[PDB]
Amino acid sequence: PLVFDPKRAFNDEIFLCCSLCCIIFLIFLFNQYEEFAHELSFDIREQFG
Amino acid sequence: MSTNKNVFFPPALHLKENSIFQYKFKNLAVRHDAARLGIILAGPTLFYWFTVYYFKGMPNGLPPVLLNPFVNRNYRGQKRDMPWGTDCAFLDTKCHEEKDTWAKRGPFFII
Amino acid sequence: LGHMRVGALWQSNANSRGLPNLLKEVMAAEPIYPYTHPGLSAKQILWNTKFNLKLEKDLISIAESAVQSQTVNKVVIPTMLTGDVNPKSPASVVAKDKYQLAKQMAEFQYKKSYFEKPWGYMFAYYCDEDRARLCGGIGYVGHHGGGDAEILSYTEYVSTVVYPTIFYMAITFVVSLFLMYYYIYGTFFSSTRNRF
Amino acid sequence: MILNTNINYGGRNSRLCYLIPLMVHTIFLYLAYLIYYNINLINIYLLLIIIIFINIEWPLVIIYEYIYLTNYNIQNNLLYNIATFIFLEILLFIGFYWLYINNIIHYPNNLPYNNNIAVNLLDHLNHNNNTDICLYIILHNLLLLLYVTLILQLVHRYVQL
Amino acid sequence: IRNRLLFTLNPTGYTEDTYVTKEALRRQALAESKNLWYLPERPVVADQLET
Amino acid sequence: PSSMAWTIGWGFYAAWIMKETWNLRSSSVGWTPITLMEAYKTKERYLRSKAMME
Amino acid sequence: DSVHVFRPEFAQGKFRIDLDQPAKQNKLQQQIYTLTDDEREMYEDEPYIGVDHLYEAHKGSKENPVVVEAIGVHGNDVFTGCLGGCHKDAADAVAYYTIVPPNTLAVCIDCGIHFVARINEQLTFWPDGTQPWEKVDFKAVEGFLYKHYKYGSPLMI
Amino acid sequence: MLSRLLHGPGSDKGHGYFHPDHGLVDSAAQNIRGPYWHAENMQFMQQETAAQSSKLPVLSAQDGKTLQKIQLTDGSKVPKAATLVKWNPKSVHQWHSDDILRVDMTKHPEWVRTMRMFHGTVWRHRPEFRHPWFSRGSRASGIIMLVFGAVAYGEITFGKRLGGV
Amino acid sequence: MINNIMHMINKYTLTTSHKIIGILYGYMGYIAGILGYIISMLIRMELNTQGLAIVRKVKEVTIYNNWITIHGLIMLFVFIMPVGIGFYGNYLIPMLIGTSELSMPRMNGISFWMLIVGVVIFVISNVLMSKPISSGWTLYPPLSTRDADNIGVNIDLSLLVVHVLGISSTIGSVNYITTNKYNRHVGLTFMNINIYNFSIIVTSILLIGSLPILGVAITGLLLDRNINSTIYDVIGDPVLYQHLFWFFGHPEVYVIILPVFGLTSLILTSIIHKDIFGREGMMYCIISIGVVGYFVWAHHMFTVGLDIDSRSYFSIATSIISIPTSVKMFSYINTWASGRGFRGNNSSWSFFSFLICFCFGGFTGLLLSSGSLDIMLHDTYFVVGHFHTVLSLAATFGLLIAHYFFLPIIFSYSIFESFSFYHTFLLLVGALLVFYPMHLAGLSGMARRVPEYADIFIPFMTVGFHGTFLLIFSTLTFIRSYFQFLSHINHSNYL
Ligand code: HEA
Ligand code: HEA
Numbered sequence A: 001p002l003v004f005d006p007k008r009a010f011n012d013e014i015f016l017c018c019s020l021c022c023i024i025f026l027i028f029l030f031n032q033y034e035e036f037a038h039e040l041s042f043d044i045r046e047q048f049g
Numbered sequence B: 001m002s003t004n005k006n007v008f009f010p011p012a013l014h015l016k017e018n019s020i021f022q023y024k025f026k027n028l029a030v031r032h033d034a035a036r037l038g039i040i041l042a043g044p045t046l047f048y049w050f051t052v053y054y055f056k057g058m059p060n061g062l063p064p065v066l067l068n069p070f071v072n073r074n075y076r077g078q079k080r081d082m083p084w085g086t087d088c089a090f091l092d093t094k095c096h097e098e099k100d101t102w103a104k105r106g107p108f109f110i111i
Numbered sequence C: 001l002g003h004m005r006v007g008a009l010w011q012s013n014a015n016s017r018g019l020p021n022l023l024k025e026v027m028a029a030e031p032i033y034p035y036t037h038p039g040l041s042a043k044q045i046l047w048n049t050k051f052n053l054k055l056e057k058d059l060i061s062i063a064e065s066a067v068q069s070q071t072v073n074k075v076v077i078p079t080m081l082t083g084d085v086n087p088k089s090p091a092s093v094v095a096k097d098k099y100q101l102a103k104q105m106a107e108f109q110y111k112k113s114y115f116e117k118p119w120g121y122m123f124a125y126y127c128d129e130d131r132a133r134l135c136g137g138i139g140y141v142g143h144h145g146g147g148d149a150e151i152l153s154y155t156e157y158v159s160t161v162v163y164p165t166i167f168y169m170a171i172t173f174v175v176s177l178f179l180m181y182y183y184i185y186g187t188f189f190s191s192t193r194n195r196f
Numbered sequence D: 001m002i003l004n005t006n007i008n009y010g011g012r013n014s015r016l017c018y019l020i021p022l023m024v025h026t027i028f029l030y031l032a033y034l035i036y037y038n039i040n041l042i043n044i045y046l047l048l049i050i051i052i053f054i055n056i057e058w059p060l061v062i063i064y065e066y067i068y069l070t071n072y073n074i075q076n077n078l079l080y081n082i083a084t085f086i087f088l089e090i091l092l093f094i095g096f097y098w099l100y101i102n103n104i105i106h107y108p109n110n111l112p113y114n115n116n117i118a119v120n121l122l123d124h125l126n127h128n129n130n131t132d133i134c135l136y137i138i139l140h141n142l143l144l145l146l147y148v149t150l151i152l153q154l155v156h157r158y159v160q161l
Numbered sequence E: 001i002r003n004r005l006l007f008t009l010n011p012t013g014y015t016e017d018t019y020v021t022k023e024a025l026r027r028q029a030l031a032e033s034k035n036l037w038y039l040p041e042r043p044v045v046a047d048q049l050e051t
Numbered sequence F: 001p002s003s004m005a006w007t008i009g010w011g012f013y014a015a016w017i018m019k020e021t022w023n024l025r026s027s028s029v030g031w032t033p034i035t036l037m038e039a040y041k042t043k044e045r046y047l048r049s050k051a052m053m054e
Numbered sequence G: 001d002s003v004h005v006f007r008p009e010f011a012q013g014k015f016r017i018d019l020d021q022p023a024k025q026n027k028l029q030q031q032i033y034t035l036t037d038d039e040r041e042m043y044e045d046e047p048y049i050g051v052d053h054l055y056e057a058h059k060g061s062k063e064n065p066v067v068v069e070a071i072g073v074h075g076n077d078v079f080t081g082c083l084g085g086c087h088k089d090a091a092d093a094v095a096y097y098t099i100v101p102p103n104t105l106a107v108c109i110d111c112g113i114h115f116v117a118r119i120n121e122q123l124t125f126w127p128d129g130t131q132p133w134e135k136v137d138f139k140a141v142e143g144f145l146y147k148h149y150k151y152g153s154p155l156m157i
Numbered sequence H: 001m002l003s004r005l006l007h008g009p010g011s012d013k014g015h016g017y018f019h020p021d022h023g024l025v026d027s028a029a030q031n032i033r034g035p036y037w038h039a040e041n042m043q044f045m046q047q048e049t050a051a052q053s054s055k056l057p058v059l060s061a062q063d064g065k066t067l068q069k070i071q072l073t074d075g076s077k078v079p080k081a082a083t084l085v086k087w088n089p090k091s092v093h094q095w096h097s098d099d100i101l102r103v104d105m106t107k108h109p110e111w112v113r114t115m116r117m118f119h120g121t122v123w124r125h126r127p128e129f130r131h132p133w134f135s136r137g138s139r140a141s142g143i144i145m146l147v148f149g150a151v152a153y154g155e156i157t158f159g160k161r162l163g164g165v
Numbered sequence I: 001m002i003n004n005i006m007h008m009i010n011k012y013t014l015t016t017s018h019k020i021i022g023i024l025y026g027y028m029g030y031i032a033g034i035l036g037y038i039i040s041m042l043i044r045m046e047l048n049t050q051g052l053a054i055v056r057k058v059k060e061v062t063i064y065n066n067w068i069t070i071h072g073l074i075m076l077f078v079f080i081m082p083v084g085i086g087f088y089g090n091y092l093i094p095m096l097i098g099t100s101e102l103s104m105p106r107m108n109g110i111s112f113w114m115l116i117v118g119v120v121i122f123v124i125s126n127v128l129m130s131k132p133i134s135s136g137w138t139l140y141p142p143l144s145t146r147d148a149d150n151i152g153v154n155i156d157l158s159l160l161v162v163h164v165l166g167i168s169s170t171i172g173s174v175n176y177i178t179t180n181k182y183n184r185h186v187g188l189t190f191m192n193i194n195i196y197n198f199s200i201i202v203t204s205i206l207l208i209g210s211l212p213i214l215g216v217a218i219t220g221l222l223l224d225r226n227i228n229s230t231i232y233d234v235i236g237d238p239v240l241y242q243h244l245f246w247f248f249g250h251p252e253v254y255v256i257i258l259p260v261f262g263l264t265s266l267i268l269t270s271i272i273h274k275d276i277f278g279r280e281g282m283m284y285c286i287i288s289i290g291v292v293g294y295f296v297w298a299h300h301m302f303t304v305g306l307d308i309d310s311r312s313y314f315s316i317a318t319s320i321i322s323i324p325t326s327v328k329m330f331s332y333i334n335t336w337a338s339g340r341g342f343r344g345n346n347s348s349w350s351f352f353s354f355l356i357c358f359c360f361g362g363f364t365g366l367l368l369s370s371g372s373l374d375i376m377l378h379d380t381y382f383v384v385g386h387f388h389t390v391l392s393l394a395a396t397f398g399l400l401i402a403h404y405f406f407l408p409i410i411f412s413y414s415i416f417e418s419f420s421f422y423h424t425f426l427l428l429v430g431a432l433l434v435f436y437p438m439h440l441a442g443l444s445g446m447a448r449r450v451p452e453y454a455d456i457f458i459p460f461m462t463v464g465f466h467g468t469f470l471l472i473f474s475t476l477t478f479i480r481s482y483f484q485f486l487s488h489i490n491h492s493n494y495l
């Protein structure tokens, strides 16, 4: 039988690193979305904007 | 005969360290990668928050930028039809509410 | 399913066409034993085959008994370089004295009469047959080549065709330069005429 | 017993030969329809669900081909293709940076406001300062991405050893 | 047409050319065992229009 | 370059990040009096111009 | 003190065929390089080693042919070739290829060389993890080989 | 170095390719003859055989003696009664010895998944067909996209968007 | 039967076999070529006649502009790359290096069907929708974005077509590079591969580097049209658009031409029974032309107001790229000498015409390289004459060499030499009567992309009329010859 093993999964280095990186990437995405809406004054209809 | 033997029952090896981790942190490349990580953690990150703590109750007195004057309020008579119908920037949520911009909903499927 | 083949014996397909049997192609519907066993009928051939087969069995048995029950008086181990799978062949294929030269000359004369001219004529026929196969509008036979073609070696070609051609090209180059400059401007070294 | 062919990955027929092109066609016609009638022919979430579902075939075939069809020749081919894809992405970023910096490197510019000195206390830094660009938060995000890069490099080398 | 829809409900199931009914299995079993008294029956033969 | 060169480069990059952080915050804090003075000056000039035109 | 077990490579099929016999598979997929211009110049003025070449029979004689081995199906014609210029009068610009029946003496009448291209089929155990880990005998192999000769076997594609 | 940057020998053109000091190791050697670059600081342990697994579906293809010769260990804590055998580089045979302790890596999820791909499913020449319902969904998606494209072309050209009829 | 129909459809839609994908590419390329030829005949009939004989209005010249733009796009992106690169690239590349398939087999099918969706969108937008795009194949803004006659979604669909064609070409390029690098049989070094393979590799390297920039430019056009930005409007830089487009543009023409050189070299080796003269030189010249082509793009922009030093630089770079092409031409001329090429072969005579016309086109384009002299020749019919005596008289005849060579090998029937001779000779003469006069019309001052011309330019267009009639005859002969190729006899009796 093939059964998922959370103990082995959490005792594996690749699983931890990738989950941490995915979490940090989501944090970065949310932060960058928070500055596009309620931080800036210029929109995509300008020269530099 | 096939290598599958060592795939099915690989040999077990003896270490003099309490774990592979410690043994694997005697390689100078891993040590240098950890050193770079520590450099970034120690210098910039602890300093960043330090500045945040140093200027916690002080203003951000940078002058605002000047985008569009009063005489150019019409944008030289340029068309401003967004692909979503109205004339509001995508992330101008408040401005959308003053022009609905979302009453023209389509169907869930082709019909 | 249609006509599924039964078994996996060899079939002549695109990937494999087999090794032709030229002897059967040539000697079709004609016996071979009048050439391999001249003067013998089928019964005589069979009787001879049986007699020789029994004799060969006896000789093979004698030879195996001999080689398998002889005492070893000497051991011969040839010299070879390290990493070499097999020793170099100690036989040379070049005649050394004049008697070997005469022997090889007689062998060459026999082989020429009986083994080389047949090969030459067979190959000539094969070339002509390939021409015939590609003839008749199927392929590009007669579009170039032939027996009248002038084949030149590298030295002859470069010396008698390439260099003179480049020489003529260079002379044409200079003459055309001068003539074109005169034609357009009306002078040789003074640009436009009646202007400067 | 089996008969062993060349090292080259022979290849399989697949539906991805037309599904991905049909996906591109669907996306572009969706954009055209949204441009024309300003409304969505099909809900955007449903469209993204279809797009995601079509592309789940890659990981499955990848798994079942690694289990069965893989060797160093195939791995080298795949890694070289990965490198070329990374190169294409780099070129895309270069093109967009070209687009951005075209009007910024060319310093002279006709501006709606004044940027000469000795007329106001702040005019002399109007053109050379976009003082709203969220620099502090940009630095925080930079720190996050440096975290990710360093941690991932460390872990990659650690497992490789 | 409906027959095509019958066997596609099970993507891992047989097809029209590989599906055998119980009666067909019984007839094949009788044919294989060379019983003396099994008188084989002629399948219903159809002309063009019927098909 | 060896690993030591890259560690030195990362140290320099960290130093630059710290410099930029501090410079940004200090400049933002330092321009408050100047911006306030400019605003007051332009407010006064506007009021004076309106009074003169009236 | 601790025990470590390196994670084995579980992949089967082509990968396990490669890792069971790395010499043969490497031979199949190992690139070899030809001489550049300066190397050709440096090679053409190297000396013969001994006077054997004046007496022995060269490699590629009617009695000492060049035997080469390909993989494929029994009876399939073999693809072989020269790199050119085995003779002074033969072309050498590019490699010249040949299609020849297997297990037969062929003669290149461009260079004059006799060769024996021949096929060895790569019949190997079904790589699904049931391969044998200890010396095997001729019985089971006898059955598999008989079936392959009589009917044929699938291809590892 | 350009050569070393592009994965070449480097300055010395007679040099090898692998630098296990910074993670560039030889997978083939590791799989066949074990990681002999860890040979100085690791040692085999020498003294529960594998015969207990002689009746399983995939291990039953082996002989009884072969599994008897293999000795197992829990793989976590050092057996205090087990001696240590020095790992000898340049020796291709020590990784295959039957005297050294081993660990039963047959309950590993990757092991189970591989053998299931070979022993637990009907062999399909197409991995997408190995999953029946997903293939159904994918072909349905293809038909859906065809219909959507046809409808969008019809609506945009004729100026009527099919919602009013 | 449903099973048979589904088997055929799946055979041609699920395939990942290089030969099948090659024949599909060839078929699509020939069809696109015929469509472009029809559009070109409409253009020529508009030019040959006085008083707007076909459009009958000055308000309706947008029809003529649509014709020129779709003719250019169809003939460049959908005709000559699918035939030159897609057809013989997939069919032959694995065969010449002795491998089974190209690496990434699925991406090949993805590439072909991306081409197909591009063609479908393009045809439906420019045939079944009103007022198509009317801005030439170089979609210069603000004509493409801010124009009364370009407001419909047909323009946007055409731009997205350009996107999908770029995607398909990138996929093909990556696949070719990867397959040639790693899948060579043992004993075949990288530089000993067939010359066609090397030309395909360099073409692939060209496409990879430049297409993303074109993608950026086209996305800029889309954003200007839809998001109402000013990237290229009066507050923008149409010159920026031109820089990006032409950074893609010239690598595209060298991509078109190099595989023709590779094919010609391969076929010559086959039909003259002698190796290439200076094979190493020809390969190195190919790679040199490929690399140098990335530094010259702005020679198409000598009149937009470049800096004078930049004008000087771009003229210099164009001369530099001229050099290796001359080396290649000399290599071909010396290759043909001392050979035994067939004397009654459409391939041989097509090679002659290819060589002559390419030398003439190269010289005319070398005149245009000089910045100063480009003041008098920009946007005249001299440029049209140039890139038609190159594209339509050298690249086309290279593909005719390949066609008359590989048909007996792909289908196993010989070629009707006399019929094909009629086709090729009339194609040569008819084209030379259409394009050659353009040169002298450009010098006299006629502008391009105009349907009505001043009375001073009558003789050039009369000669063009003659050439158009000859071209119609020739192309009808070609299509009829191919139909007759696959048809059994139609008459038979007893003598
Ligand atoms: C590969 C590209 C290609 C090809 C093949 C052609 C082929 C032809 N082109 Fe044109 N053309 C362009 C690329 C091409 N063109 C481009 C890029 C422009 C500019 C668009 C712009 O200005 O905006 C242009 C513009 C252009 C104009 C512009 C008119 C104007 O601007 O004033 C004219 C009119 O004379 C013209 C005529 C022709 C003619 C008469 C043919 C042919 O009829 C003559 C040769 C005919 C052939 C027979 C080729 C067709 C082949 C098939 C039959 C397919 C079979 C396959 C093979 C034979 C292998 N072309
Ligand atoms: C495959 C097609 C193809 C090829 C091969 C070329 C090849 C060249 N092209 Fe051109 N070109 C186009 C397709 C092509 N081109 C198209 C489609 C356009 C129009 C785009 C548009 O505007 O719509 C165009 C436009 C174009 C212009 C634009 C003019 C104008 O817009 O103002 C210029 C000018 O610089 C130019 C130059 C060249 C040069 C210098 C070469 C050189 O490669 C030619 C070099 C060849 C040789 C020189 C021949 C060899 C000579 C000898 C045998 C030796 C002689 C040597 C000496 C005297 C030193 N091309």
Ligand SMILES: CCCCCCCCCCCCCCCCCC(=O)OC[C@H](COP(=O)([O-])OCC[N+](C)(C)C)OC(=O)CCCCCCCCCCCCCCCCC
Binding pocket: I349, I350, I352, I353, I421, I424, I425, I428
């Ligand atoms: C109007 C003049 C010819 C115009 C066409 C020029 C072709 C332009 C290049 C592009 C080709 C495009 C397709 C071409 C279709 C067919 C063209 C054509 O007409 O080709 C046939 C033409 C005419 O061939 P021909 O008329 O010589 O043929 C008679 C030859 N035999 C004996 C075989 C019947 O081609 C050539 O002539 C080109 C090769 C020139 C070599 C001259 C040798 C003369 C023949 C031997 C006679 C005896 C010795 C005489 C001494 C020599 C002194 C001169």
Ligand SMILES: [Cu+2]
Binding pocket: I249, I250, I253, I296, I297, I299, I300
């Ligand atoms: Cu150009």
Ligand SMILES: [Zn+2]
Binding pocket: G082, G084, G085, G086, G087, G090, G108, G110, G111, G113
């Ligand atoms: Zn030879």
